[PDB]
Each structure stands twice: as C-alpha cells, then as structure tokens.
Design a protein around this nucleic acid. Structure first.
Lengths: 154, 67, 138, 41, 180, 79, 48, 157, 98
RNA sequence: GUGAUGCAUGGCCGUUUUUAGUUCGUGAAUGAUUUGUCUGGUUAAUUCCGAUAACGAACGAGAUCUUAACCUGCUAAUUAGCGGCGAGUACACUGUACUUGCUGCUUCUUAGAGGAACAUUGUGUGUCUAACACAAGGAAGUUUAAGGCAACAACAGGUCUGUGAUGUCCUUAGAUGAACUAGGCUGCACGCGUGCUACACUGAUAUAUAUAACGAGUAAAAUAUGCUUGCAUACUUUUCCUCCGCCGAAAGGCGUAGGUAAUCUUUAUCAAUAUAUAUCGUGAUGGGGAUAGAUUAUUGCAAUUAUUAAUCUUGAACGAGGAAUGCCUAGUAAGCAUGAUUCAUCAGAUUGUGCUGACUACGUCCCUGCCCUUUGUACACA
C-alpha cells in the first residue's frame, strides 16, 4: 500500500530518497539481528521525556530512538544535544496550571550519541561542530539504503 | 458608498477648461486628470477621475448640468 | 538550458530550476513522495496528468522547498513548476504547445497559475481573540 | 460494561458485530485467519 | 479520475427531491481525496452550499466539550465510518449518505404558525441532528462513536426508529399538527 | 556624626570656582562624583545653604539641579 | 542601610523618582506615567 | 560599544533631555537653534555628558502670569498669529478663573483641522501651565501653517 | 561603509550622495546593500489612574541600514562624507581591494 | 509629606461617543427662539441628489499611512543566494544527496522607489440623478480588507497616592522625612467576575517526518599578598542570550565557540492541535486531576506561609450541566500553543504571533440601547 507509481526519473543514490519511519524500523530489524549495541540495562528505569509521564511500554524505545537519531544525523551533519532535545520536545501537563512544551531528557540522547561514537558510525570535529558521518558511515548507510530500496521495489 | 461633495466639485471644476483635450478613452481621461489637476493623494487622483468619466458618459444622451 | 522560477503562495515559497536532462525531479534530497500527504501528492500530480509525463521525460526540474505550512509548500511548488515549464516552452523547447499548455492549466483552474492572497491579520485589542472581548459583568 | 471474550468478511467491525468480541481480540482473530486501521484488500 | 480516500468517485447518485442536489453540490470542482481543503464560505450565499457534504460533516460533527477544535481526527472518523457503512451494508457509503441527508431533514417547523424549510436548512438540520445523535450515541453507549455512526446513518437512511434525527424530525413536524 | 571637614568644604569651594557651573544631583548615595574625588553626601547640603543665601541659583529639573553662579558669588566664598 | 544591586529598589523612574510602573524596555528606565507624554519627542510614533 | 538599537533610545532620551532643558530655560526670546549666554549652556551640557506657534504659546504664559486681562490677552494673541500669517488659530484657558468653579472658553478662527495624519502633520499645538493665586490655569493653543499641499486642495487654471 | 538612521529620506539623500563621487573618480566600487528595516514597537496604557476602560497605545520606530564598499582612499572618502552628512545619520567606514 | 480636600484646581484618561453630530456671516420669520441644518430618494455618515427664505461657509465624517498582494526581468547583494567548475564520497551511463572555494548573474532571501483598484468593462435595477446588480479580467471589486487620529457640549466621572502640576487647610524630633527587624494585602461561611484543569474513544498512550511569524538578547566575580574562613590593597571581565562537549533521571552544575546582533541561540528552522502504525477499545475506566508527606537543585543575604522545581505515593467533583448571564460573522469564533511586558524567582495577569481554517445570515426592530420627525406634558434636579 505504501507504494505509489513513479513516472519521474529517480536517483536512489542515498537514504533520503527512501521512506524514513519504515527505514528506521528496518534498521531496528537489522539491529536486532546483528546486535552490535546494548539495550542498555540503564534506560529501563527512567522515562523518555519529562512531560511524557508514562513508561514507553515498547521494549524497543531505545532501539527506535537510536534509529531516529541516526536519521537526524544523516539529515543534519551539524547537530547537538540541545538540537536533539528540541527535536524530542514534548508537552507537559502541570495539573491545575496549563500545559507547556518542554524538551526531552538529555542523558538518554547523550548515551545514544556516545554509543554511536563507540560504534564509529559518527564522529566529531571542530569544523562542522555538530555530528558528522564518517565516509565509512556514508558507504554503509548508502548500501543499506540501496538494499532497503530494492527489497521493497522487487 | 456614495461620493463626497469635495470630489464632486473637484470633478466639476475640471472639464470646462480643456474639453477639447478630454476624449472618449477611459484611460486617457484618467491620465489627463492628474496631468491637469493638483491633488496630492493618488486615491483621489483616480477617484475623482472615475466620477469625471461617469459625467462624460452622460453627454451625447441629454443635458448634463454644466459646461 | 537553465531557468530558475519561484512560487509564492501562503507562507511557503517554493524555488525550482528547470534544467536539461531526462526528467530528474528532486525535492530537497527527498522526492515527490515522502513529504507525507498522499492527498497533496496527487494535488501536485494533477498537472502531470494535465500535460503528461512524456514531456516531463525530457527536462529536469530541481526543487528546493523550505519553510511554511504543508498546504503552502505544495501550492507554491505547483505554481513554481508551472512558471518553469512555461518559461522553458517560451525560451528553448516549443511555443505552439505552450499556447495550449496555458489553456489546459487554466481550464482546470486559475488557482494553479496564480494562488490566493488570503493571509492572517493583526489581532485587535480587547481580549484573547482578535474580535472577541473579555466577558463583561454588571 | 464488558462481557465479550476472545472465545467462540474478515472485517474488524463486521466480525465484531457477528461475534460480540473486544476490538483487540477481534484484530487477534483477524490475524488468526489471515496469517491505525488499514485500507481493505 | 479522482478517488475519495482512494476508493470512491460517486459516479452514480440518487435523484432525491432534485432540490437538495444543488445544496449537496457533488461535482468535479468539489471532488477531493480527503475533506479539509482550504474552502472559503465568507463571501456570498452559495459557496457554503458549494462545499461538499463530506466536508459539511467533517466540520460539523466536531463539537463536544474538550473534543472541540480537533478536525484532522474528524477526517479520521469519517474515513473509518465510510469503511463501516459499505461494509455493514451493501450499498455505496456516499449513496446511503446522500439518502440519509435527504430524508433526515425536517420538512417544516413552526419556529413562530408553521413554516416550510429552505433546502439549505433542510441539509443543515439533517447534519446537525445526525451529529447530535452521534454525540449522545457516543456518550454512555458502550459502543464506540464509529460504530454509532455506522448505525445512525443506516437508521436515518432506511427509516429505522433507532436514529435520533428521525425522532426529532417527527417531534418537529408534530408541532404543525397543533398549529397549522 | 557626619562631621564635614573644613578641608572638604574648601576643596568643594575651589571645585566650583575653577569652572563656574556645577551639577550636584539630588541623590546623595553615589559613592563618587564624576569630577570630584569626594563623598557627595556632604556637598548638596552646603550648595543648598549657599542657594538659600541668594548667591547661587538653581533652575532645577528632574534628577538634576543645574545650579548657576551669579556675579556676586565669587566674592563671598573666596575667603 | 540594606542596599544591593538587585530588585525593584536598585532602579526607578528618572523623573518622578518612584519605583511603581517603571518600564525598562530597551533600558529606557522611565515610568509609564511620564513616558506617555514624552513618547512623541523621544520618537515613539503612535502608528498602528 | 553598545548596540545601535540601544543607542537610538539613548539619543532619543538625550534629545528629550535638552528639550526640557530649553523649555525650562527659554522664556526671554524664541528659538535661535541648537548647538551640536551660549557659554553657560555649552559648559553645562558638556559637563553633564562628560512667526512661531511655540513662541506665541510662551508669549501667552508671559502675558497672563502677570495678571493682565485674560480676554484681552487672548484677543491680542489671536491678532498676533494672523498678522504673523497663521491660517487659523485656537486657544483655551481653563481653570479656577476667578470663581470656585472650573470654566473653559474657546477663541477659534479658521479651519482648525483636528483628525487625521495629514491633520497632525500640519496643525501645530502647544500646552502650558500658569500657577496662579488660587490654583493653576491650563493653556492650550493651536496654530496652522498654511499649505506641501493639503489633501483637499484642488485647483486648475 | 554603512549608514544608520530612522527616517528613510535621510538615508535616501545621503545615499544618493554616495555613488556620484565614485562615478566622478572612477573608483573600484562595490555594489549597494538593501537590508530589511527593523521595527521597534512598545505598548503602554493610557489613563494615568486605574479608573475607566483600560486602553493602550502602540508605538513604532523604523530603523534603516545600508552597506557600501569602496577601494578609495580612507581620508578622502571620510571627508567627502563628512562634508555632506547629517548628524542625525551615523556612518562606518571599511575598504575593499578587488 | 503616598496627610485631608478630585465637591477648590491643571493635565491626562473614561464615558455620552465611533454615533453623526456642531457652529458662523448676511438675509428672512415683542421675545425666548426658528430657518439655513429639509418632505422625499440614497448612504458608513446632515454622505450626496433634489425640493427649497434662504445663500455661502467652518468643524465633525470623509481621508493618510503600515500589514498581505502583482509588477517595475528597475536598483542592487550584506549577514541571501544562484550558478559554474575544483576534487570527489556511492549510483546512473553515450545528472544526483554529502561535502571545499571563489567569481558570470540578482525575479529568487529583500526593500529605496512608485505604479497598479479607478462601479473597471459590458448585461441590469434606480426619478436615469444620487445609488445599487451580474458576469468578467485581475493577487486586489463588501472603500482590497484589518489597525489610529474623535468635533460641540457635558459628567460636579477618576486621579492633588505621578510628578519640584497645584490652591487652601494640616504636621515635623515622640515626623506626617529616610533607613533597618518582623509582619499584610497568599488569612476565608460564603458571592460575583477574569481565568486555569475534566467529564474521554470525535478519545487515554508511544514513535517521527512537513513544520512559520511577531519575537528578545552583554558600578560586579574570582585570584594573590598582608593581618588573623573575615578585612585592606593590586590584576582580565563574570554580571545577556547562550551553542557545544561533559557530569547529574531531572532540576541543575562545569569549561569554552558566537554575537551590542537578517552574522551566535536561529531560522535549510523554535511550540501545539499533527502524522501512520502500534498498547487500550467508554467497563467513575487505565479517563481526568481537587489532595497529600517525603525531598532534590536553581533564584535572592534571607523560600518558615510547603516561592520555583524533578520523582513516588494521591483519586474530590465530573454522565454535558438551577434561576440567571457574557462574547462573537473571516484564515475570524473556538481549540491549540507561543512571543513580549511587569522580571533576581514566580502567569493562573496583560499586550502581540502563528497552526487547524467550524455550524448558518447579502437580514430584523421582538428585547435592550441609540438617531431623526410629529405629538402630549403640570417634567427642567429634566
């Protein structure tokens, strides 16, 4: 269903051409199989967002959060902890006082970025102060994108 | 909406001076109104001209009260 | 060769450039498919049915779309590509079919060629609303 | 109040009308036969 | 050409009274995949009637307390509701829709002495009465509002007593039997 | 206490002879004067006392004084 | 005294010499009262 | 090294400063300009930072603080501004006015436009106070510079 | 070489003053810069006392900036500006090379 | 002197009052007065047409400008770009997302400037006059809409607690001046406002793409020495928003990039109503939160009167609502947020901005309240 006919000339030369949420879902699928990363055993007792006020109830919140943060890396080669916090902002209800938008929790994203640095898929550098993909990261995520493209095209 | 006596009398004062220069064309009759008049507001500069054209479409049909 | 065209409608202003090629169309790095709303995707698809993908199969129209509402992006991009194809027909490819091209767009509607100038207003004094007053007591 | 149970046209709504079930277990039985809401085949 | 929710194109409609036809205004210009276009009504007397009846519900069933002001979910509920209409009944969802809007309007009401209703208010009170059937059929009714809709539109379109709108129409006509 | 030194009075007495126009400000809490290494609090009392003697005049303003020195002013405070 | 560089006391309107209804927008350091009559000379052109 | 936006408020408030300076001082003559007699003010401002409607307005306060007849004073001023070339004139003197009841009278000639942006750009007004024996008497004056051209001025040879 | 003011006619006249000297002297002169105007606005209540209807007024200041560059001698351009600039207008100088 | 007097005053303001009203010269009709200023038609409006003992004027209304819009292939590119090629990182095959750098170029990101909207063209109603209708081009046809300026006269409206604006009366060493300690307007049977939070599945919940604008932003730290943590003296600038990289669940803490600012937050992008699929599938329910002690960090010298604030425990009313009553016709009501002010800390206050673009009126005088004409008055404090 998610496909529609394409009469215009495409490139399919990268990952931004393909779907985003299903691509990160399939990335989580490959991530379960290869399991280079941990869960970790630290995320289970702290809620994702201050204004979430609920447990995530997925057994995969961390697993899809890493996927989304990687997609944000791919899109923006210059982002920071403040950027991810704003990207993850959520409402918060203060009872008798009005709702207000407030950012996410910094430590969860900081641990995700440190795990990504350990995985080496991303790196830092003074110039381009945000997170920038390595060229190996480019080739791996691009062949991943081509694999994802083909597995749904044919 | 109607039109104010200020613009009505400003429309009457002109025409009588160079009717030999006024002609049928609406755009020409517009242009000559600022070409000859002294009004500083462009909204008048076309608003009075509208009524001037409304007056000359009454000629060659009956008396038009003036000129 | 290369023409750069603009579309201004509501908040979003679309920019496109019709270039020589085979039909490569690009929306940022995205294509015309991942913006999300398949409802507006077909709204942009309407001209391609009006004209045809065969003619689009010989020119490249790059697009950068940035800022503004979801509706305004699509509504600006349709006008931008229409102006681009009109400019290419006027300049490089063909004029006689451009004559009918304008006619077949305008037959569908005038909204494509030029959009609307509706926009919001400065909210007025008196209460939270622009035209609503605080509740009064006696 | 609730009295429907999972115990015993794969449309969720029509099958729920036919069998007086909860909607979660109605989609459960949908999965049981076939294998937010979707466009139909 | 177009497809309502990629499914419907309403290429065949009922005659009805032929008068409500101009009010319901189903045509290519008003054809759309989903409601909640940028349509405007604040200039004249027609374009409110020009707006498609599908939009006339996606914007009119919306009010209940907190639930006010949520219209994307109104398109959601109508999209699902159209599914359930053609699923629980063998007829076109939009066709039985037109049937319901046609036969769900009060033919007269005194309102200070009985007086006939213009087709505009004929459509208007039909929409209003079915939507206020929806609200009290979603409150304290066990079943969800979607299946409540799937019940009420068929109840009003086939002349079944279960629809709130038809009971209110009978009450509203009954005032004529006392005044006129 | 707040005893005003004679040397302080004399220093202020030459600070306005050297120029002829002075502003003293109503507010006395400032730790220093822009052109006076002096505590201000001891200077407006005496300037106002002098103004009460019809020798220096003040047109007054908001948060400013803008005194003026008269023709008959350099003589009385010289000694 | 009990002076500090904080609160409503460390600053006040520069003509009325009062701490009530003082506006510091762009550090203007004036009260609404006297400001409403100085608005034109200072440059605040009541427009729309 | 302050921001230019902040500096705009600064020179606005300073300009208002020197404005109230010269309004508090200037009563013996009219206006002879501002510098970007003279010695006292030059030193004062330096050490501090380190045919006229207004003339007739101040002439009004000068004519009535001394107890001269209010009516004749106003009439003299309404002669003064025409003979200078004022297109019209207006003057109000409101207050105790010899009686335990406030009273106000008006002496108007000419157009005296009173509403609009072209009204404000042409009309010239001024207000003043006059501390008297048993209260203060407010003065208002208005003088029109004759017609850049007025919006409603139309004429063709 | 940038200019600051609030009333547009001042910058317009002192900017028309700019390029005539450059045309006369045939200098290596960069093109003009036309920045969006800044608007400074505040709101304040009328009615000194609390009595009556609460009513407020809104204000506005339009602030106008442009930037130029010239490969001309600093002293000569400074003087040819100072000759025909208004104190109500502020100027900054900078140079180019090519 | 924030002591009395706003019924002694100024100024300002709020009301009659955003309506359509007000006045004069001359003429005419014991006097107060009348006409002009009107039977009628029209209207945003004594706005105009017309009749007319009036003729001619002035104010008010009218209008002007900002916001949106099209052009001026004008004017040009800072802090906006467009390219083009310089090498490519992966693919196509006879250009592409991610990058470096400058210059062929300025409709594009923009403002200097004016223009364009003028019952505009024809098909109609109207005494063929004032005015009003359709269709159309056109972004712009209800003055293109929305913003402000408010005449005459009045109120014994509010304020002398805003002022060194101010009369008169009243007071100063046991102040009616200033400062300092603590307290109060947060305390409460209740009542009324302005508001803030639910009564769910049109919703309760987790993931994320597509998200804009008005916005707003720079007289003190710490170190060393001497005396013995504190005082005195010396050196940078901390004293705004902050980005980043770290620490802490968080609050918050640490060291730094940027910027006095289309340049740094931030803007090839800042909130929410979202989204499509996923847990639930209206069962006082898991909804919803009146309600708690325990505390942790910031704000200020001081948080007790739990300022603010992170978590766990809490589980009142609530089935769409007594008599009554408010506001409101277009990107507006409402929902949803959010900017700014007051700011050391605190919106549940006030003033702006944006998203979603709802149900129906080309109206009426029934209520309420105004305007005009005639009429009756024993009312004039009306």
């Amino acid at each position: 269903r998610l496909l529609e006919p394409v009469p215009f000339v495409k490139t399919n030369n990268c990952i931004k051409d393909v779907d985003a949420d299903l691509f990160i879902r399939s990335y989580a699928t490959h991530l379960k199989l290869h399991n280079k990363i941990t869960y970790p055993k630290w995320c289970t007792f702290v809620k994702t967002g201050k204004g979430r006020k609920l447990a995530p109830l997925n057994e995969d919140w961390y697993f899809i959060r890493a996927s989304s943060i990687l997609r944000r890396l791919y899109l923006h080669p210059d982002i920071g902890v403040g950027f991810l916090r704003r990207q993850f902002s959520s409402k918060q209800r203060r009872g008798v006082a009005p709702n207000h938008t407030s950012l996410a929790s910094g430590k969860i994203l900081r641990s995700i970025l440190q795990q990504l640095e350990n995985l080496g898929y991303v790196e830092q550098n003074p110039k381009k102060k945000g997170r920038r993909l390595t060229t190996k990261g480019e080739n791996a995520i691009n062949n991943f994108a081509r694999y994802i493209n083909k597995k749904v095209y044919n | 909406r109607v039109r104010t006596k200020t613009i009505k009398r400003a429309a009457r004062q002109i025409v009588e001076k160079y009717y030999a220069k006024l002609t049928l064309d609406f755009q020409i009759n517009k242009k000559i109104t600022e070409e000859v008049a002294i009004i500083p507001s462009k909204r008048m500069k076309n608003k009075v001209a509208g009524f001037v054209t409304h007056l000359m479409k009454r000629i060659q049909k009956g008396p038009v009260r003036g000129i | 060769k290369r023409v750069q065209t603009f579309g201004k409608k509501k908040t979003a202003v679309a920019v496109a450039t019709v270039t020589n090629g085979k039909g490569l169309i690009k929306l940022n790095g995205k294509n015309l498919d991942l913006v999300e709303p398949y409802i507006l995707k077909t709204k942009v698809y309407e001209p391609l049915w009006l004209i045809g993908s065969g003619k689009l199969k010989n020119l490249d129209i790059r697009i950068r779309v940035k800022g503004g509402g979801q509706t305004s992006q699509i509504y600006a991009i349709r006008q931008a590509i229409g102006k681009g194809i009109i400019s290419y027909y006027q300049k490089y490819v063909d004029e006689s079919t451009k004559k009918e091209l304008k006619d077949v767009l305008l037959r569908y509607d005038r909204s494509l060629l030029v959009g609307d100038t509706r926009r919001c207003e400065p909210k007025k004094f008196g209460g939270k609303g622009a035209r609503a007053r605080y509740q009064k007591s006696y | 109040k609730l009295n429907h149970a999972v115990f015993i046209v794969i449309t969720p709504s029509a099958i729920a009308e036919k069998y007086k079930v909860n909607l979660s277990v109605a989609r459960a039985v949908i999965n049981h036969l076939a294998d937010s809401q979707k466009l139909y085949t | 050409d177009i497809k309502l929710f990629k499914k419907w194109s309403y290429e065949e409609i009922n005659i009805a009274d032929l008068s409500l036809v101009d009010c319901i205004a189903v045509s290519q210009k008003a054809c759309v995949y989903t409601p909640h276009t940028a349509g405007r009504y604040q200039k004249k007397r027609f374009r409110k009637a020009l707006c498609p009846i599908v939009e006339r519900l996606v914007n009119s069933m919306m009010m209940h307390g907190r639930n006010n002001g949520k219209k994307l979910k109104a398109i959601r509920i109508v999209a699902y509701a159209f599914e359930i209409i053609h699923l629980m009944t063998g007829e076109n969802p939009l066709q039985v829709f037109v049937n319901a809007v046609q036969k769900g309007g009060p033919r007269e009401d005194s309102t200070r002495q009985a007086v006939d209703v213009s087709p505009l208010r004929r459509v208007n009170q039909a929409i209003y009465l079915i939507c206020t059937g929806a609200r009290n059929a979603a409150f304290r009714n066990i079943k969800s509002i979607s299946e409540c809709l799937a019940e009420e539109i068929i109840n009003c379109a086939n002349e079944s007593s279960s629809s709130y709108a038809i009971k209110k129409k009978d009450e509203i006509e009954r005032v004529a039997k006392a005044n006129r | 206490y707040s005893y005003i030194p004679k040397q302080n009075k004399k220093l202020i007495y030459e600070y306005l002879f050297k120029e002829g126009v002075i502003v003293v400000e109503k507010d006395a809490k400032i730790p220093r004067h822009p052109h006076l290494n002096v505590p201000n609090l001891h200077i407006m009392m005496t300037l106002k006392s002098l103004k009460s003697r019809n020798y220096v005049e003040e047109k007054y303003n908001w948060k400013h004084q803008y005194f003026i020195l008269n023709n008959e002013g350099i003589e009385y405070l010289r000694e | 005294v009990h002076p500090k560089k904080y609160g409503q006391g460390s600053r006040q309107c520069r003509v009325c010499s009062n701490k009530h209804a003082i506006i510091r927008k762009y550090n203007i350091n004036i009260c609404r009262q006297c400001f409403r009559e100085r608005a034109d000379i200072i440059g605040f052109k009541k427009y729309r | 090294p302050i921001s230019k936006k902040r500096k705009f408020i600064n020179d606005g408030v300073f300009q208002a400063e020197l404005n109230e300076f010269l309004a508090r001082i200037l009563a013996e003559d009219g206006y002879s300009g501002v510098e970007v007699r003279i010695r006292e003010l030059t030193s004062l401002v330096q050490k501090r930072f380190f045919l006229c409607a207004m003339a007739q307005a101040e002439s009004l306060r000068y004519k009535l603080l001394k107890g001269l007849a209010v009516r004749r004073a106003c009439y003299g001023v309404l002669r003064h501004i025409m003979e200078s070339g004022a297109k019209g004139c207006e003057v109000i003197v409101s207050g105790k006015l010899r009686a335990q009841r406030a009273k106000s009278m008006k002496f108007r000639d000419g157009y005296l436009i009173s509403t609009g942006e072209p009204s404000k750009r042409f009309v010239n007004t001024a207000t003043r106070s006059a501390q008297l024996k048993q209260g203060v008497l407010g003065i208002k004056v208005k003088i029109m510079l004759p017609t850049s051209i007025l919006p409603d001025n139309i004429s063709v040879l | 070489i940038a200019l600051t003011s609030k009333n547009l006619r001042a910058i317009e006249k002192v900017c028309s003053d700019i390029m005539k000297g450059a045309k006369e002297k045939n200098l290596n002169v960069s093109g003009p810069v036309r920045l969006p105007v800044k608007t400074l606005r505040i709101t304040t209540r009328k009615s000194p006392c609390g009595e009556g209807t609460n009513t407020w007024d809104r204000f506005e200041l339009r602030i106008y900036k442009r930037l130029i560059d010239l490969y001309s001698q600093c002293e000569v351009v400074t003087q040819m500006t100072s000759i025909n600039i208004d104190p109500v207008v502020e100027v900054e100088v900078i140079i180019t090379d090519s």
